[PDB]
Symmetry: D2
Subunit: 394 residues, 4 copies
């Protein structure tokens, strides 16, 4: 069919208002078509495209594909976390970020290592519905708060998928509007699509009970997905995680080139008081976003979710017998993460997840690989906080 | 043999095999950090780093499908990344044409989220058929927000008052401006918290994002302030008052980097046939999702559907700092009725803190330069310093608006 | 004339004489030179009003204008209910004019709403909003949630320990034990679902319960201390750092009150016919919507508001609160409100309006509601004191009335701004 | 003796007789038969107290309990300064007990701070904080900025035109034209640099200026209207949607007031020797710091607070505001405060404390400061009315007193939270 034609001929056919057998040649043709519309057609010459596996990308991850964008991947490690060691991949183009995180890791290792805990777990979706009157939306809120109402909604939600297991609902009214926050674990997937499908069936079951209910939007921004929101900071979203470590005074001096007292003075007055003066919600840290973003790009995550996933409060305190040691913790209530689906279906992304031992589904305990990866992120963020904060104090 | 191979390093490393260098590290003849300088070529430094790393992993074959060969590590080494074991391919798709200020743009988007490019492209089509979009840059200046301490809050009050006088601001401006060509200090903004004093330095930065530049100007500026006030302590050159890579109302209100607005009118027929919904439905969803819903969620600056998706994809493609998506995605999306019978859709996106550049950082790498070249904004603009960065900022905001149109249409049609 | 301090103290210590036998000057002499500090004047001097008079005379000597208190009234006020309950070092009272806005037509009833203010035009403006609602068929309201909160901060040795405590509180058995201890402290103390938040080794625990018709702070605080005492039995290394760790949150702006509610969460609504908007409010439905969106939503959003998506709910909350013996400082959270306005009816020319206020902190028993003047204003509304046959119904009704009066005030001021003066 | 309606009406319409020649019962007879509208009572009745009396009588017969107003007082109060200035449809006044905390040792002076509250122990607790400050060698304060704001929203045809108007206001020549129009309205008006914000075709414009010793709302609003009139001459397509588009921001929580200031921005501080912390506050510096960090910074942070990094600033702000004739609804923003506690001295055993309050909205002229009782409390502090020679000094001084009294309250409540019980 298309194999017996040439490159010039197939371009002539689509131009004339009128399929291809190999994925890489389809990319090549799309690149040549695009060149015709650019002022500099030679601009694509150093954008690569050759010998990348487009089979896993077409239809699943990307459209109108013209190549790929290489992001340098460095390793910060070993990170000593919950009695294990992790070599953490970090895809970035910011100078010194991987070296600085690496120093944070070294400080943590010498201090006995870090311990972390996952405090909560459940991706959310927050549709907006409308009723004729505020008295009607109030009725629906009351009904969703009975055990009988919650049970029928749970049955409908949980029918859509193996890992669909609905947790306590959260609701807010604004006149005749009602926002409904559905939360559920989702195996090792980040869970956006799963929870959305569950939410649609739950909302259709709710329609049966309340026929005058309009479903205005399956996402009414009450989730909240990929925008700053106090609701994510307070209620959590995805994995809520806490990590901690004590850095001996000697290590703060030799490795970090500062003191425990100076580190505490900067953290309080930068990460708490300064974030406070700037009007931050959830941004009580130095640069958690750098680490989250770098790990996310390396590990096939949705990097747009660094908006909520980077929420972090970094606290530093005096510790030990002489009160000269550095206690540090990071608390990240809304880490949106997964080891199956999305960009984690791609082979290079899986290489980075494999380094950490979290690639794919955990067959023995659904959701444990994603939980582990969240812990690693929170741990690596803490390393980053240590090093950069030390650089600022000194 | 161990000690024979050590003598060959002293003369060089090219005359030893991979295995002999690795054996030299494992037995402690040579420390692992000394491989950076000794090994000549960059790709063989990456290869030996990988092989050393692989034997430490629970799965030795983990890095099999992580590519590393035939990539330009020369630009990456000592500038963009360290402990490099390879690189991560992010698919690039193209959305366009985007009809913006009488130009057409083919917008590159680096993402792994399915249908994002296709959806954004459909937004672009509704905009093209509506007569195009128009944007303006409203403000420009990267910031840095150090925190200094004085012994008493009365002293910090003294310093703030001095910085607010015409005379004092002039002396600080001169020290700041001396560091760079583009460094031109705008009006200072300060907040006291007791004896803490937070000073927000703001300055244009040519076509660079400007973080490093404004930081150098800040250090020398605070050096001159130290002369007028010896008891002042420089606690941290960033005291989170910038604010960089964290959510902050100050960025939303004062702006950071490029503040931008974009707008378009989409005829009713284009809303029906291209977007598969009505103007009345789009407006009802925008109000109750992007305003009221974001309000009920306690959002500062997140009055949009999915601005972050587009900001992130363009940023990765175009060599930006993708972590700056935190502040750069700040956006309010507004929809209202338009035209004679209120049946046309007016849309605007306003994004007060797009942090962006076309020189420096990831924009120094060649694949990223290719994507910047597509848009006609690669490198520095010689005739008009800052114009390439301002143009990219306008493309981001316009592409965001096309994204909002498409996703909001899909939510309205349910 | 005043005799020496020694004789005066013997007359003071004598049971059959007391302070009644001493002069104002002699009382003032004993204070000036210790023996009596000043705060013991209340528990010594014959009458409350004389104690105030003495206090005013002492204060006046200290001031740079001795006649400063001349027009600060004090005589013939019922101080007996104020002493040891509502106020200390009392030198008098501050008259706040009270107007009446109504009838407020709400849930098929009519209310005459008292309002204590010094802002010109507030009561008349609110009365105009009431008239518009009344001619539109009236307002409807619903209490969506009810529970005063306290948000202590406790610390464990490590974050891992605080996580253990969070998880234990989340089990049915752990919560049951804590609920038992909380609920044992009072007949109204009925602990609802807990929300907790970790920050390192800190653990913030938000206790929520109804509290009859009382605002409930004192009662919830008592419940909380007993619950934390019980939690310490299971976790002996837990330090209670503060019974309030600002997680409640009380009298400070906080997203948590907006999102979770605090006290009473209420919604009110009404439809104003097109004609009524023109005749009473001197504007149009179309114009009110456009101002509401671009001021109360978009303007509030550009200013970086959490919970402040309204025009002047604070004006109404404060005036009703002062009038009705509420804690006026709680206007900070009680003012939280989103005001919404859209087109309604066959024509799509009628004005739908709603006010949602998630954190009205209110009560008809305790605190300032113990005083007779503020009880007269509660009596107007039919909500004074406890409702015996339905505990909490009076405070619920008062929250409904606040939300409804806020909506009246929203209608009127938004019409004024739309009509350009 | 009560006459028929028609006879009563001739007397009412007789210009040398009027309502004075009718009985209360006859005026009420006329009102119930719809001859006189109830709102017109104000200008028909001679004495204002009598107007209040008849309004109450009409009101009582509408209430579920007719005797509900018995203990709402009304007699012998000066309604002359209230009627058509501070309140409408007046049925009496509401006594709020006034207590006094002090001496507050602030900027080498001593203040006797008046506080109108119904919360038990607030005055005594604030008084204890004052004592700790006084024995610690005093507090020092500075007004860091000063200017009331108004934040109108205007609409242009397109976002491109709103952008044009913004750029025009930012030129030195365009600003000058606007500043001339603004400053022409009042001798105190001095327009500072303009802050602006776009949302599509909306433009929010934040006018800021001093206002003498007035709080300044009506003055700034007058100057805003004149300034936008001038702006309309250069951009006649501009539509002035609302003179307040919530960008001020007045009486709602808003990050803009926190970050930019509104009214007076003030900072206060003091060092409390360890000995005073022990004897007055019953605790240690170490314990107070740990509570302050984890409650007022971390707790407020976990609650998602903007500007509420304090314990009970609103308690003190509200009490002084009611006493001193301020607008108590402005406590919403005026309570914005960050309280910071730090170790000081050679063994880290003294307590550095500071409160920073960026948006104190305050005045000593106009509004409720026109009433005599409120003026008595202003006279107490030596700040009543206008400062002739140094305009603004009285309002500034009151703002410093509010910030310092807040710091006193923070000291005392935080010490009580730190010790326990
Ligand atoms: C690359 C890292 C992340 C870094 C470091 C750093 O970690 N230095 C120590 C080091 C370096 C190399 C090896 C070992 C140790 N210092 C800075 C820095 C700080 C202030 C300044 F003015 C300019 C540069 N940055 C960039 C921070 C930037 O990405 C977020 C920052 O703006 C967030 C904030 O703190 O506000
Ligand atoms: C990939 C895009 C961005 C997209 C679309 C989309 O644009 N669809 C129309 C279309 C598709 C294909 C070709 C042409 C046009 N619909 C959804 C979606 C919404 C709700 C739902 F339940 C599940 C999927 N998403 C994901 C949104 C997601 O990444 C941010 C979203 O969560 C932000 C929000 O609205 O809160
Ligand atoms: C006293 C009331 C509350 C009021 C009215 C009002 O309701 N007028 C109509 C009316 C009057 C009398 C009888 C019947 C109807 N107009 C204003 C006003 C607006 C803008 C302006 F520049 C200056 C005065 N205010 C003060 C608003 C003030 O307390 C919160 C306001 O600042 C909150 C905001 O909108 O941002
Ligand atoms: C009335 C004052 C302000 C006060 C005091 C107080 O100041 N005590 C020391 C004292 C007393 C008497 C004389 C001398 C010194 N303690 C409490 C209190 C704390 C925890 C508790 F569970 C219940 C009561 N409150 C009420 C605080 C309340 O109005 C805002 C508070 O809720 C704000 C907060 O901390 O979240």
């Amino acid at each position: 069919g298309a194999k017996f034609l040439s490159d010039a001929e197939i371009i002539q056919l689509v131009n004339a208002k009128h399929l291809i057998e190999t994925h890489e040649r389809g990319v090549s043709i799309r690149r040549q078509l695009l060149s015709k519309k650019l002022s500099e057609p030679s601009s694509l010459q150093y954008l690569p495209y050759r010998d990348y596996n487009y089979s896993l990308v077409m239809g699943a991850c990307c459209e109108n594909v013209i190549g790929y964008m290489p992001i340098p991947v460095g390793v910060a490690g070993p990170l000593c976390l919950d009695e294990k060691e992790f070599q953490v991949p970090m895809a970035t183009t910011e100078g010194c970020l991987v070296a600085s995180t690496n120093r944070g890791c070294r400080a943590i290792g010498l201090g006995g290592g870090a311990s972390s805990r996952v405090l909560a777990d459940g991706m959310t979706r927050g549709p907006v519905v409308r009723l004729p009157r505020a008295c009607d939306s109030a009725e629906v809120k009351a009904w969703l708060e009975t055990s009988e109402g919650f049970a029928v909604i749970k049955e409908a939600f949980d029918s859509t998928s193996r890992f669909a297991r609905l947790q306590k609902l959260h609701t807010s009214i604004a006149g005749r509007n009602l926002y409904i926050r559905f939360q559920s674990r989702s195996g090792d997937a980040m869970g956006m699509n799963m929870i959305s499908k569950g939410t649609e069936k739950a909302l259709s079951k709710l329609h049966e009970y309340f026929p005058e209910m309009q479903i205005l939007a399956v996402s009414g921004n009450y989730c909240t997905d990929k925008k700053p929101a106090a609701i994510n900071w307070i209620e959590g979203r995805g994995k809520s995680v806490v990590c901690e470590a004590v850095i001996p005074a000697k290590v703060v001096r030799e490795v970090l080139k500062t003191t425990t007292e100076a580190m505490i003075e900067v953290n309080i007055n930068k990460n708490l008081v300064g974030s406070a003066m700037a009007g931050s919600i959830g941004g009580y840290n130095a640069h958690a976003a750098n680490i989250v973003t770098a790990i996310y790009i390396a590990c096939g995550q949705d990097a747009a979710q660094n908006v909520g996933s980077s929420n972090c409060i970094t606290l530093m305190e005096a510790s030990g017998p002489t009160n000269e040691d550095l206690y540090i913790s990071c608390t990240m209530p809304s880490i949106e993460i997964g080891t199956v689906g999305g960009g984690t279906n791609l082979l290079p992304q899986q290489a980075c997840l494999q380094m950490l031992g979290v690639q794919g589904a955990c067959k023995d305990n659904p959701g444990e690989n994603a939980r582990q990866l969240a812990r690693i992120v929170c741990g690596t963020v803490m390393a980053g906080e240590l090093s950069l904060m030390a650089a600022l104090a000194a």
